[PDB]
Design a protein around this ligand. Sequence first.
Ligand SMILES: Nc1nc2c(ncn2[C@@H]2O[C@H](COP(=O)(O)CP(=O)(O)OP(=O)(O)O)[C@@H](O)[C@H]2O)c(=O)[nH]1
Ligand SMILES: Nc1nc2c(ncn2[C@@H]2O[C@H](COP(=O)(O)OP(=O)(O)OP(=O)(O)O)[C@@H](O)[C@H]2O)c(=O)[nH]1
Ligand SMILES: [Mg+2]
Ligand SMILES: [Mg+2]
Lengths: 426, 428
Amino acid sequence: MREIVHIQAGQCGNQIGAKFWEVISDEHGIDPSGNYVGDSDLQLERISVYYNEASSHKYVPRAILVDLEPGTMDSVRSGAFGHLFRPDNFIFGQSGAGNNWAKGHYTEGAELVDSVLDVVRKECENCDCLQGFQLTHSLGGGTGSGMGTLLISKVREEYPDRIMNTFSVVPSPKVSDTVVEPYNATLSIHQLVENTDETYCIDNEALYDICFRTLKLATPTYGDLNHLVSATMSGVTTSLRFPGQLNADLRKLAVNMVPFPRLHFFMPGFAPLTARGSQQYRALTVPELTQQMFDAKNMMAACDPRHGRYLTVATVFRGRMSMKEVDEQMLAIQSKNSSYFVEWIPNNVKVAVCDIPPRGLKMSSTFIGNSTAIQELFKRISEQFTAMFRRKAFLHWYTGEGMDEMEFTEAESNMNDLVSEYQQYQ
Amino acid sequence: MRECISIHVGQAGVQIGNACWELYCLEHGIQPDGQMPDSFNTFFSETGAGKHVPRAVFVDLEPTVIDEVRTGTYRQLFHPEQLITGKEDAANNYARGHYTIGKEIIDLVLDRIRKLADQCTGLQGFLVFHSFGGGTGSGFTSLLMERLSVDYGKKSKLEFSIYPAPQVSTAVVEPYNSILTTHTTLEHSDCAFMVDNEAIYDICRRNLDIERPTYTNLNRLISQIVSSITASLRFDGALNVDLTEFQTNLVPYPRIHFPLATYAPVISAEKAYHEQLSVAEITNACFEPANQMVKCDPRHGKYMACCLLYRGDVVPKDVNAAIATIKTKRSIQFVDWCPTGFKVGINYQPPTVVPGGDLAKVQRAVCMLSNTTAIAEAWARLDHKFDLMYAKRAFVHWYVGEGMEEGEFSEAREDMAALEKDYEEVGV
Ligand SMILES: Nc1nc2c(ncn2[C@@H]2O[C@H](COP(=O)(O)CP(=O)(O)OP(=O)(O)O)[C@@H](O)[C@H]2O)c(=O)[nH]1
Ligand SMILES: Nc1nc2c(ncn2[C@@H]2O[C@H](COP(=O)(O)OP(=O)(O)OP(=O)(O)O)[C@@H](O)[C@H]2O)c(=O)[nH]1
Ligand SMILES: [Mg+2]
Ligand SMILES: [Mg+2]
């Protein structure tokens, strides 16, 4: 009930996906074989949200692991909790399409788009009821940005009545493992402003910065970064996936967080983040989680909440607490940080709670926030784009494959029109 | 032979249904099975030899809520079908609940209450429990209340709205949906009770001394005021009060029917032994500017009428003496046209306490449902929230995309607007 598909793209999504189910399988006591071993029944009641119930009381996810090269999925099959996936949902290609958006969007994506539109069209109508669509990609690559953007663009014109979402790892200047990621991200955002009604602009820059000061780990691998994002979006969906004292599903938070269609680019968060040593000293309580998740350093994105004011936020808890200590504080947050919150919209918060905790912890939250701080993000990409676009550099990889030059100036106009709206309300 | 029944909308109403029916089953001695090892005739339906079942419907689009009941301890108590359950929630939207998703589910709930209505000899009215959050409690009740206005226009239509507080709002679009929901309740419902989440917090924080109150402790208090209103029917009393005369005393005008509520004795177990509860004390406790469960200033707003429903070991003289003390107090005033603002109700049933309940066992208790102009202040705060964001045209395209028109929002404000003037005019 209120089911939803799960899509990947590139190294990012497929690696995020591998740990997306490392935790959810633990939230339901699922083995890597797909077998149910968990003891609780609250977790099994809504197994149907993510899992097509297979024979021998087994469970396997929707999990459309799509990619333009087999290097990822050949790894995911060997990875832990990799056998539970369906092999039919391993939609591979010949060449990974490189970091070229157009060569991953127009032709080489079209070569494979029909193979992945049929399997989602299979899973979609197979579901009793679908809440929406959900994927995990990056705006910097060509795979996650070329076909991962084409894909959702074709799913909305096939299923426009259904809301959806996307967890897009945006590029960054410091952690920049790509040259043309302005072009890849400037062109994907051209579609995501209309082809998706909520985008969680995670950025790999912060996820290191969080793990140095807060976790204080000496070897943050990509997995350790993903363990934040995997346990993050699990919080976004825990409302509908488990019972709750107060529930906020993907639609109930999207509708009341997005005032205008263009303004739906978010930043997530996750309150309890501690070293293995400094956890015992910190008594985790709702007033302390709350101040920990509204600050600048906990939220995972390449922007500063201090500069830009909040429009809307939400706090999806995963603990058995009292709603008094929750909302008395989140009014106190808006009293202390009244300048940082917008005055037009009173009580920008949309709180939500779940009765069950995650494994190991007693309490947890997630901070989704639509701010004007991400103005600086898109304002920065337009600077990287404009400097690289003034001199028509790297275009012949785009222009030769397709991608007429007029479309580049259209993309920056929208993003310049996008930030133009954030400053309009700021 | 009175047959008062109770429909429930939203997790606000459903989780109150868990409290209200946990309470009633403790009153009559009904086990959680539904089989008791007359009073129950009002709320329950006898079946077989000893099996009793509640006359209610827990309609809720979000299946995650009702599954707590269908996976709970009252599984074998509630009739399986009257736990109506949709498939996709209204998601804090009048539009998604009022028209779009409502059409898919009215056929199940209407035909079930109709199976309860005709089964009842003669019913007084149905108790609604809908919050103004925006989901089922705002739109799905709007269509439900009007379809019952045409089906049952004569019968009383009560409700208990968890009105969003002005200082605190659990969601973002509560300033919208509460203003949209005002139309159906002022035109259909005969008297619409109001409750705040921030108000109940202050009671249980200050008096009961609980700094971590949960919704299983809030609703456990609204379960009592509802039981207080219905104990006149559900049990005998030396001076009973029926719903048709209850609302007759609060409602001098047809539109002025939005009272607040109050429940004086709210004290811990150890707190009980130290302080003896007298009829003149619980009476005076109700008239405090904070003991009521609506965030307002009763000192500024003149009272229009009241129905004090004492219950338990109570006598009438000290009620008649207590109310004499109230009229002498200068902080408590009444409008000129109303010489008498006190209706009274007594019954020999004390309030029943849930085991492991924050509430204490008291030999007597009182609930009063005051209709006054103090509620205009709470509404003036949220009407300022509405026109503020609505001036910016915020979140309207989520409604317009669902089917409603932009003109409807101004009309709903106009209905609330003229409603504010009514409390001001009668105050003169
Ligand atoms: N925070 C994380 N960031 C990641 C992870 N994996 C990749 N990335 C980042 O995401 C960006 C996306 O790169 P891709 O996944 O598209 C590599 P791929 O060859 O599949 O893309 P194409 O260039 O389209 O072929 C890249 O700049 C990385 O810095 C991860 O596990 N965590
Ligand atoms: N007193 C009290 N109020 C509640 C409770 N749960 C929710 N509310 C109030 O109800 C409002 C939200 O409406 P809900 O009843 O959750 O509506 P819903 O069932 O979520 O409807 P959908 O959004 O369509 O799922 C909030 O403003 C809360 O203040 C509760 O347990 N007790
Ligand atoms: Mg790639
Ligand atoms: Mg709900």
